[PDB]
Amino acid sequence: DLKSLAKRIYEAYLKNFNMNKVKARVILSPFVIHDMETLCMAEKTLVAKLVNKEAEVRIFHCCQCTSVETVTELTEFAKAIPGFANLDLNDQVTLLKYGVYEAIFAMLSSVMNKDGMLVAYGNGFITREFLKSLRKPFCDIMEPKFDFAMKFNALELDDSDISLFVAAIICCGDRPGLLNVGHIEKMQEGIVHVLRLHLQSNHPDDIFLFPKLLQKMADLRQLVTEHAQLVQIIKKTESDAALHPLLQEIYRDMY
Numbered sequence: 001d002l003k004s005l006a007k008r009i010y011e012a013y014l015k016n017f018n019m020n021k022v023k024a025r026v027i028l029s030p031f032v033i034h035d036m037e038t039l040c041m042a043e044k045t046l047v048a049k050l051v052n053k054e055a056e057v058r059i060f061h062c063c064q065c066t067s068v069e070t071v072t073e074l075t076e077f078a079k080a081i082p083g084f085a086n087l088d089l090n091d092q093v094t095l096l097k098y099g100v101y102e103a104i105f106a107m108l109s110s111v112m113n114k115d116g117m118l119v120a121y122g123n124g125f126i127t128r129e130f131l132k133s134l135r136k137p138f139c140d141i142m143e144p145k146f147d148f149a150m151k152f153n154a155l156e157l158d159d160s161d162i163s164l165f166v167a168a169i170i171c172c173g174d175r176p177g178l179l180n181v182g183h184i185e186k187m188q189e190g191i192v193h194v195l196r197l198h199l200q201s202n203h204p205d206d207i208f209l210f211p212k213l214l215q216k217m218a219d220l221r222q223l224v225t226e227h228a229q230l231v232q233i234i235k236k237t238e239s240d241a242a243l244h245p246l247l248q249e250i251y252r253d254m255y
């Protein structure tokens with residue numbers, strides 16, 4: 001009855017996310033993008049959307065397209081979280097609007113290692129150093145996410161842990177403008193309880209793992225706010241490009 005909830009959530013997570021941690025770790029060893037040269041020969045096969053323009057824009061257009069694909073997946077995942085579909089539609093929409101990027105950056109850690117991150121469904125690998133060399137302010141976009149991911153990955157969670165974590169992020173009672181705050185809080189309370197007991201069984205060698213994950217929740221909220229602004233600046237200083245319309249509405253005057 002608590003076991004069951006963890007199982008239903010894990011199964012929803014396996015069904016709805018194309019990329020997960022087991023799949024990514026196996027992969028992380030294919031085609032490396034480490035400079036402008038290797039970037040272009042990536043774009044002869046891997047990235048077929050803006051197919052020219054400034055390399056910084058091509059890169060993060062490709063990146064925002066992946067984020068939008070993750071938002072799509074997160075929406076299906078949430079509909080499978082027991083209780084979520086029973087909320088008023090505007091509460092479901094509100095939870096997703098304010099929750100998806102906290103979940104995105106949490107799950108992004110799974111396709112990152114200290115050297116770089118998987119891209120294009122794991123058939124490309126862009127190095128951390130290469131991103132760091134891009135012209136300002138594009139070189140500052142992914143670095144704080146790598147920083148988060150390195151600390152997160154050190155916790156050595158598996159997908160059964162992460163599925164519960166992501167459900168807890170989405171079912172959050174303090175998003176602005178919720179109608180049934182009481183019930184969403186009870187949903188959250190249940191998931192977080194199951195998460196704690198799950199971590200105690202799956203990781204009995206780390207007593208402080210549950211508090212460490214609650215710290216990561218706090219970290220992600222800060223990470224998302226800071227990302228919103230960096231995104232805003234790039235829209236102001238740069239319009240060779242175009243921010244995805246969905247991301248525009250999500251980021252707008254939230255934080």
Ligand SMILES: CC(C)(Oc1ccc(-c2cccc3ccccc23)cc1)C(=O)O
Pocket residue numbers: 057060061063064067068141231232233234235236238241242243244247
């Ligand atoms: C993590 C990621 C990929 O961060 C982005 C960073 C920059 C852009 C971006 C990409 C292309 C043009 C832009 C213009 C103004 C502001 C941002 C952009 C899109 C996403 C995202 O928000 O999904």
